[PDB]
RNA sequence: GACAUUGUGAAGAGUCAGACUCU
RNA sequence: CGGCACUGUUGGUUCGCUUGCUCCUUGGAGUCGGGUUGCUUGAAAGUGCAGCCUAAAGUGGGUGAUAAACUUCAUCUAAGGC
RNA sequence: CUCAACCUGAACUCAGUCGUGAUUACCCGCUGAACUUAAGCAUAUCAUUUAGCGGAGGAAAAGAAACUAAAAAGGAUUCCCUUAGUAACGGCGAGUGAAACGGGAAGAGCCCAGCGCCGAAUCGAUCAGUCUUUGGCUGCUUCGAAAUGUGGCGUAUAGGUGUA
């Protein structure tokens, strides 16, 4: 399958996902993202009993969540994983972000992005 | 018309037992079919992304050559119905006009 | 939402992008078994609108079905009858390929319940469907008061009785004069009613 | 071999009819069973009417029957609004709601609005908690005369009345009824041809 | 024989007005 | 053994519901439809079902039982479920 | 090349589940004859039926209109009477053959996807308490599912915001 994906001709809208952010820019992007990771499990544990005794800025994730933010022009930066399979889930985001003048980049790693969000992918 | 000897007509253009008409209000179920603004944006963006089908491209070539009858016959054969063929031909003619204005 | 975009994109199956994706996927599917468990739906929005939830107990299988007519299984095309029954080749099955695929999935997986299915690919020889099934004994299903219906004995093997959406399409159910042949819920029931001789008590 | 003057036979007995035979020996048994079911339902839902929901008045559809009325499926939302009854409230106080029917004529709407009004007049509402009544609930001695109603709720009357004799008016006699009917038929039949002629005349 | 599976390039010929058709 | 009705108690649960005004909003695709083939129907220029080819739209789509354009309308809202 | 993710795919006498096979009267999906009638016979008829295969229940299936119709209109499904041996089909031969309106039995309505808002507010195992323990309730128990999206509002009668 890997060989076939190279042998066949790829249409531009599918090929746009092959060219991703370079290593340095990706490192900068992940450095910025890591400053607003969601609440940890240990943080949740420590906060739960304090609240029982008694929402900052965070990276948002999810195509439907991100799609709404882009359409409302509320997102400042959008990062799209390059290996989303099925690809139709994110096939519209690059064109949608560009239609609403929202900066976007295809970054490498749906798993890397999942780590930022304390998820799998 | 009601009057001497006539209380209503059972035949003709004005047949019908007399009755008073309430003002007509559209039922909710009738609203299905109207494109929302967001749906129109979605369809236009998806058109931009995906592009055209092979028969659509053939029809575009015919319309550029200005063979409207040939395009209509081809669309009747492919889409199947005269109504749908007319609709698709009109949409593709609009595409041709937009392309002309944009480029030239 | 993104789901509307997925739906509209999937409506354009002749576009270059979806043609490329379908070509790759069809090649991949042709190399697997006829019935094969799939980790996740290939069309999450289609599955969602057919009734799928990303919850424990919902499973997806891919079924490959051979295309074409149904050849009459007789030796050397020998029917032994009147000429009206000599047809061997241009005979079409009563159930659609999708219904056959759901039936195969349900037969193989006897402990699950077929919920629905959808089209994912096809070439000149095969049609590929993905069947969404439910495990009626997982507690995540039994405790949810909305999926409890499929956990009742009266829904055993819906695809074998033609109750799924694909199955019902072949039964000719509907309202109006175009569908009057199935009054009572089945053509067989209606035929029995119309062809029974009624002897009233006092006549 | 039919012989002589006979009506040609028509009996549809050429199928294996012996496999599909239905007798009616259980007709009285079914009657008894349905009576017992009604009695059980009445005991279950007393003092509510045994028939169940109140149904609406309806004109029979086609011109062969349009001079007759009958019980409908329910009351349209327009009728409920005209009678000042919420749909939610109607479901609770036992009034059938027809969510498909709509009213296009004031007379039809008004008949059902009046029907709803008389049903509300005849209604007896028990307090939600017997200890504590509220507003709208029926009064104490009203709740004593409560009895289960059998048969249709507000049954319809099918008696036929005769218009009072009157005087034959001169204008009535001077009308040409047959000529009028034939004129109406001709006008409807030739409407389109005359429009075509008018369009051609305009074009010339 | 036609259509689909059926993709990526060249050369020739023919249509048009960069497309199509064939070989 | 059940069914009820009322009392008490236990556990959970209730920022809701109706009508007016106000502004906003509103939908299922290899599906529908079309060609052809076969079966089926009382369904007759195709009632229902299916194979292959084709393949949508968005006041759009279906239907109004004689096929087609162009017109008056009327009536529903398919391709998900109990 | 080291480590760590994800994706895909495995092995387990891993922890705990579930399916298989019977029954025939009725029920649901398929497959599918010929005898016979036509005074022959091939379409037709028998018959969308014997026979064959699969799948349930106490009933099943159907079911809340992409309906009927053309009134001053009816209004889910199922069943009965009537329509009616009628319209229609048919080597227009032999034969076949409904439905709506009408009168009744019974009557009960609803939930999603999508759009939008809250946005993980949702859920399974395991551990510990506790009870009326062949199962339930409580959690800083520990794991996992879930952003390729679980839950809440909400579905054509619409719905939602604010307001009285």
Three-state secondary structure call for residue D23: strand
> What region does A2 belong to: left with phi over 0, alpha with psi -120 to 50, or beta?
alpha
State the Cα angle at C92 between C87 and C95, rounded to 5°.
Answer: 145
**Is residue D60 a contact partner of residue D125, using CB atoms and an 8 Å limit?**
no
| B37-50 and C16-30 helices, crossing angle to 10° | 70
Touching partners of C (3+ C-beta pairs < 8 Å): A, B, D
Q: Assess B51–C contact: CB distance below 8 Å, yes or no.
A: yes
Q: How far apart are CA B41 and CA B19, in angstroms?
A: 46
Three-state secondary structure call for residue A80: strand
Three-state secondary structure call for residue C134: strand
**Is residue B40 a contact partner of residue C8, using CB atoms and an 8 Å limit?**
no
Q: How far apart are CA A43 and CA A49, in angstroms?
A: 11
The tokens for C40 are 């996740």
**Is residue C37 a contact partner of residue C61, using CB atoms and an 8 Å limit?**
yes
Q: How far apart are CA C94 and CA C70, in angstroms?
A: 9
Report the run of H or E that residue C119 belongs to, with start and end.
strand C113-122
Q: How far apart are CA B71 and CA B95, in angstroms?
A: 14
Place of tokens 């009535």: D172
Please report, for residues A11, C2, C24, D160, D169, the alpha-carbon distance to residue A6 in angstroms, rounded to integers and kept in the order given. 12, 28, 11, 88, 98
Identify the residue among C3, C4, C20 best suited for mutation to test binding to B, counting B beta carbons within 10 A and taking the highest.
Answer: C4
Ordered DSSP codes for A2-51: HHHHHHSPPPHHHHTTTS---HHHHHHHHHHHGGG----HHHHHHHHHHH
Contact B15 D175 (CB under 8 A): no
Q: Distance, angstroms, CA C67 to C1' G114?
A: 32
Q: Which of C136, D184, D41 is nearest to B15 (CA)?
A: D184
CA atoms within 13 A on the CB side of C164: 28
φ and ψ at residue D46, rounded to 5 degrees: -60, 145
- Among C residues 41-100, those touching chain D with beta carbons less than 8 Å apart: none
Contact A96 B46 (CB under 8 A): no
Give, as ranges, the nucleotides of chain G with any atom within 7 Å of a protein CB.
Answer: 5-9, 17-20, 27-35, 42-50, 54-63, 65-81, 85, 95-117, 119, 123-125, 140, 142-151, 156-158
Residues of A in contact with C44 (CB under 8 A): 86, 89
Q: How far apart are CA A57 and CA D109, in angstroms?
A: 58
Per DSSP, what are the bridge partners of residue A104?
Answer: A78
Measured in whole angstroms, how far is the alpha carbon of residue D89 from the centre of its chain? 23
Residue A102 is given by DSSP the state: -
Measured in whole angstroms, how far is the alpha carbon of residue B82 from the centre of its chain? 11
Q: How far apart are CA D82 and CA C76, in angstroms?
A: 75
Ordered DSSP codes for D53-100: SBPPEEE-SSTTTTT-EEE-S-B-HHHHHHTT--HHHHHHHTB-B-SS
Q: How far apart are CA A109 and CA A80, in angstroms?
A: 9
The tokens for B85 are 């063929």
Strand-strand pairing, C58-66 and C35-38:
antiparallel
The tokens for D162 are 């005769």
CB neighbour burial string for B90-104, b if at least 16 within 10 angstroms, e if fewer: eebeebeeeeeeeee
Three-state secondary structure call for residue D13: coil
φ and ψ at residue C4, rounded to 5 degrees: -60, -40
- Contact present, D and A (at least 3 Cβ pairs less than 8 Å): no
**Is residue C182 a contact partner of residue C173, using CB atoms and an 8 Å limit?**
yes
Using the CB atom, is residue C190 less than 7 Å from strand F? no
Touching partners of A (3+ C-beta pairs < 8 Å): B, C
**Is residue C114 a contact partner of residue C101, using CB atoms and an 8 Å limit?**
no
Q: How far apart are CA A91 and CA A14, in angstroms?
A: 8
Residues of D in contact with B20 (CB under 8 A): 105-107
Per DSSP, what are the bridge partners of residue D105?
Answer: B21
Measured in whole angstroms, how far is the alpha carbon of residue D81 from the centre of its chain? 20
Q: Assess B54–C contact: CB distance below 8 Å, yes or no.
A: yes
């Amino acid at each position: 399958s890997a060989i076939l994906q190279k042998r066949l001709k790829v249409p531009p809208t599918i090929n746009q996902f092959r060219t991703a952010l370079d290593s340095q820019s990706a490192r900068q992007a992940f450095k910025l993202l890591d400053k607003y990771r969601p609440e940890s499990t240990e943080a949740k544990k420590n906060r739960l009993r304090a609240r029982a005794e008694a929402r900052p800025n965070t990276v948002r994730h999810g195509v439907n969540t991100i799609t709404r933010l882009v359409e409302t022009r509320r997102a400042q930066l959008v990062l799209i994983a390059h290996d989303v399979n099925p690809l139709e889930i994110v096939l519209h985001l690059p064109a949608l972000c560009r239609k609403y003048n929202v900066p976007y980049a295809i970054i490498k790693g749906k798993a890397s992005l999942g780590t930022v969000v304390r998820r799998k992918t | 018309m009601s009057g001497p000897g006539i209380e209503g007509l059972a035949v003709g253009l004005n047949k019908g037992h007399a009755a008073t008409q309430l003002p007509v209000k559209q039922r909710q179920n009738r609203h299905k079919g109207v494109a929302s603004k967001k749906t129109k944006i979605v369809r236009e963006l998806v058109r931009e992304i995906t592009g055209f089908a092979p028969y659509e491209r053939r029809v575009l070539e015919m319309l550029r050559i200005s063979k409207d009858k040939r395009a209509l016959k081809f669309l009747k054969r492919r889409i199947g119905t005269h109504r749908r063929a007319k609709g698709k031909r009109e949409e593709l003619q609009n595409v041709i006009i937009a392309q002309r204005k944009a480029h030239k | 939402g993104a789901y509307k975009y997925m739906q509209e994109i999937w409506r354009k199956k002749q576009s270059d992008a979806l043609r490329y994706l379908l070509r790759i996927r069809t090649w991949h599917y042709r190399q697997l078994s006829a019935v094969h468990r799939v980790p996740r739906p290939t069309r999450p929005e289609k599955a969602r609108r057919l009734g799928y939830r990303a919850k424990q107990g919902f499973v997806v299988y891919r079924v490959r079905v051979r295309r074409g007519n149904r050849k009459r299984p007789v030796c050397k095309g020998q029917t032994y009858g009147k000429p009206k029954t000599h047809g061997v080749n241009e005979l079409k099955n009563a159930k659609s390929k999708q219904a056959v695929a759901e039936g195969r999935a349900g037969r193989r997986l006897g402990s699950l319940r077929v919920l629905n299915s959808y089209w994912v690919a096809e070439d000149s020889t095969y049609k590929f469907y993905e069947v969404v099934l439910i495990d009626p004994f997982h507690k995540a299903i039994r405790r949810n008061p909305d999926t409890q219906w499929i956990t009742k004995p009266v829904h055993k093997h819906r695809e074998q009785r033609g109750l799924t959406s694909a199955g019902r399409k072949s039964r000719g159910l509907g309202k109006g004069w175009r569908f009057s042949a199935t009054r009572g819920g089945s053509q067989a029931k209606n035929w029995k009613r119309k062809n029974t001789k009624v002897f009233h008590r006092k006549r | 071999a039919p012989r002589g003057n006979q009506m040609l036979g028509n009996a549809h007995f050429r199928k294996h009819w012996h496999k599909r035979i239905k007798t009616w020996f259980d007709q009285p048994a079914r009657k008894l069973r349905r009576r017992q079911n009604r009695q059980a339902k009445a005991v279950e839902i007393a003092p509510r009417p045994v028939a169940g929901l109140l149904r609406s008045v309806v004109r029979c559809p086609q011109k062969r029957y349009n001079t007759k009325t009958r019980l409908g499926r329910g009351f349209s939302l327009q009728e409920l609004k005209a009678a000042g009854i919420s749909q939610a409230q109607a479901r609770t106080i036992g009034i059938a709601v027809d969510v498909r029917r709509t009213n296009k004529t004031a007379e039809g709407l008004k008949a059902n609005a009046d029907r709803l009004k008389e049903y509300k007049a005849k209604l007896i509402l028990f307090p939600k908690k017997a200890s504590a009544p509220k507003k709208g609930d029926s009064s104490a001695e009203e709740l004593k005369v409560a009895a289960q109603l059998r048969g249709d709720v507000l049954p319809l009357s099918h008696t036929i009345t005769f218009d009072e004799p009157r005087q034959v008016t001169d204008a009535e006699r001077k009308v040409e009824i047959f000529r009028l009917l034939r004129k109406e038929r001709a006008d409807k039949k030739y409407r389109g041809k005359r429009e075509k002629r008018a369009r051609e005349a305009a074009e010339e």
